Symmetry: D2
Subunit: 309 residues, 4 copies
Amino acid sequence: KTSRVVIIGTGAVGSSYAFSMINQNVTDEMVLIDLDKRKTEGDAMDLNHGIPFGAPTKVWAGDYGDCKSADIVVITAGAAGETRLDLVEKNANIFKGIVDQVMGSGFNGIFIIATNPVDVLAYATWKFSGLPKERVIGSGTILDTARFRFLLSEYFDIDVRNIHGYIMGEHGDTELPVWSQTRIGSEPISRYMDKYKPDGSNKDLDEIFVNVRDAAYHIIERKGATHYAIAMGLARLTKAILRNEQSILTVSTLMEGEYDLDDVYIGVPAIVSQKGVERAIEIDLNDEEMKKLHHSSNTLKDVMKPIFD
Amino acid sequence: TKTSRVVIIGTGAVGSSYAFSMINQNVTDEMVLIDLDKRKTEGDAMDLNHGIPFGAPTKVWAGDYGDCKSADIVVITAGAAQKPGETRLDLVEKNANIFKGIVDQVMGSGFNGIFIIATNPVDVLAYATWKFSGLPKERVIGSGTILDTARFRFLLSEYFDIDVRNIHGYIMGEHGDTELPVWSQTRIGSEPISRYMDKYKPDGSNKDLDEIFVNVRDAAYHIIERKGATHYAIAMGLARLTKAILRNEQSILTVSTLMEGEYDLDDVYIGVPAIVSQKGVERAIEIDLNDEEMKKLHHSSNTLKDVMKPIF
Amino acid sequence: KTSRVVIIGTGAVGSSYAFSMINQNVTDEMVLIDLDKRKTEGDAMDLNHGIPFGAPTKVWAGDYGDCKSADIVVITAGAAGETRLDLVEKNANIFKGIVDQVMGSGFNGIFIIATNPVDVLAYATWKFSGLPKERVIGSGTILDTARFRFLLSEYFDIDVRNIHGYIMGEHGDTELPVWSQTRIGSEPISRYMDKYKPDGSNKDLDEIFVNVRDAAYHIIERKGATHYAIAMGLARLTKAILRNEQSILTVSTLMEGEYDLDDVYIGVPAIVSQKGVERAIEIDLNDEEMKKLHHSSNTLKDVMKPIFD
Amino acid sequence: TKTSRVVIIGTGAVGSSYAFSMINQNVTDEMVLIDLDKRKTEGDAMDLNHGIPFGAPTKVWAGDYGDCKSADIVVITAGAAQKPGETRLDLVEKNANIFKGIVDQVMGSGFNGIFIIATNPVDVLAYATWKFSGLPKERVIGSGTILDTARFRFLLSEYFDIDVRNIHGYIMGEHGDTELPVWSQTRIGSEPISRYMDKYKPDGSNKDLDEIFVNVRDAAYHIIERKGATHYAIAMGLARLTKAILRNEQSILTVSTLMEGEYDLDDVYIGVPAIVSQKGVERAIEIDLNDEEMKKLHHSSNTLKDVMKPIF
């Protein structure tokens, strides 16, 4: 009854994801795969010190054959891409090689895709693997949504568990905040502000969204890489799956009619469980929000159609 | 040393279950038990104090009122339960008298923390504690409808086959016969329940929702009718409230707090969504209610005041 | 990959065990069985409030058929027995009925026995069930040993994790402390005392053991029942099994040559895992300790031989 | 408010990994990052400060020395690493100078907590911190051999296929080349390892035990040889030590502390089993050693004093 998570890519993202998981105690077994076998052995050696400190996760450097019994394969590997276009091509090539090797092992679990552009690469994984959409999941806007709630929690001086807001769309420039669905406790945000934040403005809220949208940029400009944040997001998603939570997370999943979208992976609130994505939830959007969501879909499709038939 | 301490007054089924939940959840550093029967309470503490060699480090002992001096929280579970030969008012008078003595003994020790009241009727006795202690309303909290709301969300989580953390509903008012579900504010994820049902619960009926609320309202009665007593449920609610205070959450819980104008109510403790933290109840939140909900909440308040009026 | 624990008996012990487990979050599913079906439904109703408070264990009142997929069946039920002899007979009768119904369901997991006399009833369960010894385990001296370590931890003003001592034998009047194997950190207790407790005496240690031996008596004389303590012990044992710990616990297991004992369940240090008891550990005993252990075995056998062929 | 705060000085791989381990383990309320490059450290803090919306409530920010005033613990990971063109003494001198400035800035803020030193050479720099701070030895602790001991127990747990909590062995001495396993005190459950092996490990050899110790001693070298750096391992050890202090465990950890007569050693920090609690190191425990072990421990102490002597 043991669980196993395989991590492809032991760069900053994969290694931080591994370390978050070991400290949170989410899976029984974690297998690390990457190109440089000697290096990956070193990565596993450094990571494999949890047991004598009360963190029982077993961690080792493996190969694609170890995916056969894996519940989840998390892909963090990628190219390291001057232009966005060049990078997507390079990453699509990398993903074909990775996904083919995973499927060749007999793997029949769930893919989590972390590598950017995450929506495009989640779609790639779905195409390359031949798996049902429910079992191929991009991290999507999970982190954007977390940041959105965290900033609102600070703005309202209330527990983040009582902030209810989503970021939808591409994980990137065309993401949108769904203000029409944003609630503080059970009340629409505007009503809550009328009562408890009377000096608050639409300016403040717009600034909050800009802070979310540009967070990675502002981290990267200071320390040259980001990884801890997405690691926490990936661990959250992994727990929803392994613990069969049936909880709502904004992940990248395949549209098959929802929001009048089709044939695109995009970030939407979705029910996540041991089944993967059970349902892409359709929430009511105002006209401007729906327009922004379709713009984001169109944007993604313009990246996808040069790569996929 | 930055340690936390909770004192539990009353080591009957509710107080003992609360202590056991707390020990197993690892919420406080120190737990002191106080009750009338000193020898029994020593035995209660002995039985409860086995967490340490099993990796639950809470220190548990039988104490006295002087041990409240350094306590962060005093949880009162002691009191009589209404018996056939007496009215609701007769019970209020009796328990109010009991609380006067308990609160005087607590304050006499130098205590300067937060009271959590669990004894029924919890709204009336929380108001009594506020009056007797002289403490600010923020620091006197009745468990109120915390368990009713938890049951409400749990039932809805099963009805919709979704994580309970994605169910957003409140039970408000008196903890008892006159409580009300606030269906106009009930959301599944971000959406009003009516919209969610339209989309994802086609075989659902408003009758199912009424059944859910009846199940909440009558839960204690149905447990008691089967096993003669109830205590595990409220123990979990008390532990939840304790955690919000000790961990300084500033989260929304439906607890009993003093109305001073909220919902056009005054001079009454009643169950409402409230921000709870290390400061106690920071704020009673006013959520918009429909006309029928507001009417029910005022009826609930009136009902409470009818049994308080000949004493307070 | 879900785990299931069935509890037979929803009196004080079974209910406290259920409540400890729900709060500790050890198993996915807990099924309650007892004689009064309506009462047991009530017991389950009161216990089943963890979910909305973040304790995800599913709890329900069931029947013997629910044991089919159970990983563990914990027996806490018993008679409520003026003389010790009358009580053992009554409990043996009860256990035959319980064990037959459990085996009739197709159950193929592990039995934990909590009901006293626990060694005799563990042996009964082994006989009645026909299961391998590894999978029939009495709580034994798990609680006695916990008390022993806790009292020593207070005596030496050190973390209980650094106290290493065992209570062996019958869970009852003929239990023994194994002082020759008692260590504070890695040092024999006498050496540690020479250095850090110079005014300590054998008197103090004897008093500590007497306090362990008579703990239940002193609880019962004050509040008329004991249950929280054994609940914590049962939860500890359950975690060792479900988490496949391979940890050393003093449980009641069958002797098949160990300590030159045979055909008796008795409390000894044992390795406990998902396999049940992998090994009864033989530790070196001094002559007096070995004599006490054989006296305890003889005592148990005198209770057993009137009941079992 | 009873909150705990840990300040980390140095936000390179070790300090950042320590912060991330702590956030995920939920050990402290507040974590302040200090390092030389202010803009980078702001970025480090930003990346690390995403625990809250994922249910890890630790507050994390980039700060300055003034934020040490209320800190319970300051963890120093900053310093240079020895480079080809310099000796061990040259590194000691350089890092001792670095520590003088860091410690002066910490004390200048009004700090009155406990120092944990992680920077290598950890025994020498812990002694330096003790000297520079003016604090009691109890409150200045080097991580010492905590990770070596953890690795030792882990390897033995795998060798015997038993829970690591039932393996009882220590690595003592300098954290480095001259550390020693104390095989004469190594126990599997309550029994000496030789006895346990006689009974339950028939294919076992003393050569396997030597191999295990070599694996411990050379672990960092073998990690670095493969991936160029090591940091996750020590981060877990630092989190373990932090937990013992903040949770007031009074548990035995092999950490670096001042010798004042123990093991017939004086005027040196060295790794020994020690009682660790909210008070810091309460006691360096003296365990009986065989003649060869005592000789090795004194050799280790001598080795440390040889590189300290031309500076202290």
